[PDB]
């Protein structure tokens, strides 16, 4: 399917952005697309053999190419606060079907002061579940991060698990009323009372932060909130 | 008041 | 093909010389529409058309840009095989009956057009009129070649002769077709 | 713009789901798109269509007789078809894609065997503590949360191995906090196991 | 010299017979003045027309949904479009104005010819008769073909070689969808 790059991305005001599309092979139509909880599916301009066919009504700063290969680049310049919006890739082959890609999630700060990575902690099953249901739920919290760029996954025994496995959709904010408040996430791992009893399986909730690159400077004396993976573990017991 | 449309050419393949 | 009515929805055109195009739609032979490419502006060619018919000139500047790119992988196909100049042929005549002082209409029809690049002006009495002069786009014919047709708006007058002068590339000099009373 | 849908819709797990759309202003010359979008994901085509009907692999579409309605009809509603569908008209002349409001579906399991509870659960590296209320009925609402308390909202888990399926919600606080005290403000039933 | 020059043309050419139930679509990929591909309706198919075309024909049916979305045409843009013709065009009704010239000063016993001008009408189906005395002419009209104004009007000039005798009256007669009734034009020998 279409790909797209990066999927996340910090910036603050003044700032530029370029973002990478790769469509459908064989496509020759690329569609840029702005969507927003706000104003919802906003058109920017659409590339068919390295020019610009259709235009929407976002301003200059707001510009495109297409290359030979159909692939495309879009730049943003200036960057402002309600500029942080996914920035959609749509493909097509020509005039037909529009096929999306996964969109650059890019959210445009103030400043870099309130990003934080994320605490994760793990929460062993309890012992009542066990014996009433045969089976073992454990609880991952993630808590204190901003923004909430971050991919939550499972891993027992050093091998991905998704069947049991339950994360929220949205990550909740701590803070509901302060505007730079931090998120939390929560997630679910349901197994067999016995297999979470063997000592020897290892139970792993791995968190994914996207934050700052090496590229933006850090003037505070904290630890720089780069893109890093925070985890907690789990062993079995009898 | 519906717009019409008109017949859309194939692109040839010469990427 | 036989048939009872033939419609173009979508006589498409472009050339390298310019570059230039045009968007059209054509109904037993008559212009419905041609989208002003570079207004992007629909201009109906009747005012019953303009009442209820509507259609986006976006889709002829999408069309186009294909054609462009059509255009331009045949040329590597066909060896750069570059299109042959016809001799275009010019008639003059009036829209109705002229009769000295009633106000007449000049019609100049320049046909077998190609490629469809040309130059049809008026000249009365030698001088070139430019007021009451208007003519249509490039009209598609069965053999691929054009024809277009001229208008000029003029009151007869034995004082007044009139003639249609064609420029063409297939033309050695410009062709001059005379009308008078 | 010219496509109208349900804000939001239900619909049971495994059976098929009927998401209606309707479009009376709709052109002899219009295409009928439905397109789905997973949060915190892109849109994901489904299918088209002008008149009657059309299927593919993913879903099938019903397009009236006079096309001033459509329905798009999932055949096996799994877990993973949760998200925001939306019904849209397209003239496929290499034009933009414009959204509607979409309809919110949600997809509910089928409890075999609810045995509502509350759990606590302990921190593996340490007096912090989680509440877990699971394995109630999908028509129970975890409803919401005091400040210093944090609640999540339901969450189905499905256990391939076992063929089982159960509702979930944690509840945690950095107090006071206890397990009845965490989700008294929803409608708990009262057959909710609270172990000792 | 002359200005060397590459001319494309895609024309989407929708014939239609019987009203609504014989419509077919040819769409038309032209090089220069040469056809070298196109769609037919009838066939279902894109085809290649010169050695020009099989590349293109060969990418355009190996695209699923390209070629669905050319067969749809037949519907989306044939169809759909003649609806409209049938508000606006094929209910277009412009009466003609007939008119009867000579083309000399008018002499008894002299050679002249009668111009009976049918100008300004609409649609093209017309049917024009020269008379003379209650009897139709047929040896010495010449009429010319239909011409086109291209302002949606059509015009015909039928031309008569006659000798006006004294007392000869001559008819134009003219048929067309916009009249009730045929129309008749006169037309007599000076006294
Ligand atoms: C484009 O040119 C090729 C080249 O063929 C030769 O070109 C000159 C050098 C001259 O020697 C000509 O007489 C030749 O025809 C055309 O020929 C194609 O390719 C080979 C030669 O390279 C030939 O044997 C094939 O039969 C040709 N293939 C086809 C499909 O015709 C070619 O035809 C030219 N293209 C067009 C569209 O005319
Ligand atoms: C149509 O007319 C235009 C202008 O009347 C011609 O363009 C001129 O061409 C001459 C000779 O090629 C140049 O010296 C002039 O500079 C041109 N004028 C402009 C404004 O560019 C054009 O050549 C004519 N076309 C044909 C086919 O005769
Ligand atoms: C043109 O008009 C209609 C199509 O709408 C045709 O009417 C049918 O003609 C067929 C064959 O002649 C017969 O089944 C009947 O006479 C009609 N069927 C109906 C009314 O259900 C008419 O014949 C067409 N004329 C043609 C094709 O020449």
Redesign the pocket.
């Known amino acids: 399917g279409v790909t797209q790059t990066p999927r996340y991305l910090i910036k603050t005001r003044g700032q530029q952005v370029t973002l990478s599309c790769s469509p459908i092979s064989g496509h020759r139509s690329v569609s840029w697309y702005q969507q927003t909880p706000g104003q919802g599916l906003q058109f920017l301009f659409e590339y068919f053999s390295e020019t610009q066919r259709n235009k929407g009504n976002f301003p200059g700063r707001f510009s495109g190419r297409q290359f030979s290969n159909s692939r495309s680049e879009m730049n943003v310049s200036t960057l402002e606060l309600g500029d942080s919006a996914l920035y959609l890739c749509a493909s097509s082959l020509e005039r037909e079907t529009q096929y999306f890609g996964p969109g650059t999630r890019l959210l445009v700060l103030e400043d870099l002061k309130n990003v934080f990575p994320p605490e994760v902690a793990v929460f062993e099953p309890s012992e009542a579940e066990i014996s009433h249901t045969q089976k073992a739920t454990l609880v991952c919290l993630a808590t204190g991060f901003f923004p909430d760029h971050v991919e939550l996954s499972w891993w027992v025994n050093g091998k991905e698990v998704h069947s049991g496995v339950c994360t929220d959709p949205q990550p909740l904010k701590e803070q509901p009323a302060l505007n730079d408040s931090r998120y939390a996430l929560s997630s679910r791992l349901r197994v067999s009372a016995t297999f979470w009893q063997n000592p020897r399986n290892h139970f792993r909730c791995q968190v994914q932060f996207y934050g700052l690159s090496e590229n933006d400077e850090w003037t505070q004396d904290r630890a720089k909130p780069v893109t890093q993976i925070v985890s907690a573990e789990a062993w079995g017991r009898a | 008041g519906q717009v019409e449309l008109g017949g859309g050419p194939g692109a040839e393949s010469c990427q | 093909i036989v048939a009872d009515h033939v419609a173009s929805y979508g006589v498409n055109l472009y050339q390298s010389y310019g570059p230039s195009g045009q968007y059209s739609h054509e109904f037993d032979g008559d212009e419905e529409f041609y989208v002003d490419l570079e207004r992007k502006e629909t201009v109906w060619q009747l005012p019953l058309f303009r009442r209820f018919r509507r259609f986006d000139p976006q889709f002829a500047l999408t069309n186009i840009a294909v054609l462009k790119h059509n255009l331009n992988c045949v040329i590597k196909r066909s060896n750069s095989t570059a299109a042959t100049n016809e001799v275009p042929e010019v008639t003059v005549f009036s829209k109705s009956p002229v009769t000295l002082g009633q106000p007449n209409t000049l019609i100049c029809l320049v046909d077998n057009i190609f490629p469809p690049?040309?130059?049809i002006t008026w000249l009365s009495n030698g001088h070139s009129v430019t007021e009451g002069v208007s003519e249509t786009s490039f009209l598609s014919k069965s053999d691929h070649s054009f024809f277009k047709i001229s208008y000029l708006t003029f009151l007869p007058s034995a004082d007044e002769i009139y003639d249609c002068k064609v420029?063409?590339?297939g033309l050695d000099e410009p062709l001059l077709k005379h009308w008078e009373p | 713009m010219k496509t109208t849908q349900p804000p939001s819709m239900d619909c049971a797990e495994g059976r098929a789901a009927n998401l209606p759309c309707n479009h009376s202003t709709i052109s002899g010359n219009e295409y009928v798109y439905w397109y789905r979008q997973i949060h915190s994901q892109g849109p994901q085509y489904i299918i088209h269509g002008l008149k009657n009907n059309e299927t593919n692999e993913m879903a099938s579409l019903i397009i009236t007789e006079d096309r001033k309605s459509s329905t798009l009809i999932l055949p096996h509603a799994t877990l993973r078809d949760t998200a925001v569908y939306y019904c849209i008209v397209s003239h496929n002349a290499g034009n933009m894609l414009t959204f509607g409001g979409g309809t919110r579906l949600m997809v509910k399991p089928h409890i075999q065997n609810p045995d509502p509870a509350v759990y606590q659960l302990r921190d593996s590296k340490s007096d912090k503590s989680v509440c877990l209320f699971t394995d109630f009925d999908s028509q129970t609402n975890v409803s919401q949360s005091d400040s210093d308390v944090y609640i999540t909202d339901k969450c189905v888990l499905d256990m391939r191995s076992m063929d089982f399926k159960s509702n979930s919600a944690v509840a945690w606080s950095n107090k006071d906090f206890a397990c009845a005290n965490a989700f008294n403000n929803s409608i708990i039933p009262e057959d909710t196991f609270f172990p000792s | 010299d002359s200005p060397e020059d590459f001319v494309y043309q895609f024309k989407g050419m929708c014939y239609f017979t019987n009203g609504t139930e014989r419509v077919r679509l040819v769409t038309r990929y032209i090089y220069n003045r040469e056809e070298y591909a196109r769609f037919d309706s009838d066939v279902g198919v894109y085809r290649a027309v010169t050695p020009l075309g099989p590349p293109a024909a060969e990418y355009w049916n190996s695209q699923k949904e390209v070629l669905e979305r050319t067969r749809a045409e037949l519907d989306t843009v044939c169809r759909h479009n003649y609806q409209l013709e049938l508000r606006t065009t094929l209910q277009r009704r412009v009466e003609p104005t007939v008119t009867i010239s000579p083309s000399r000063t008018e002499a008894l016993n002299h050679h002249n010819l009668l111009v009976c001008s049918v100008t300004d009408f609409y649609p093209a189906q017309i049917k024009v008769r020269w008379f003379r005395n209650d009897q139709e002419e047929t040896t010495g009209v010449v009429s010319t073909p239909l011409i086109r104004n291209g302002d949606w009007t059509f015009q015909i000039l039928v031309m008569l070689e006659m000798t006006p005798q004294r007392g000869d009256v001559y008819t134009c007669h003219v048929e067309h969808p916009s009249l009730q009734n045929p129309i008749i034009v006169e037309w007599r020998a000076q006294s």
């Open positions: 690049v040309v130059n420029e063409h590339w």
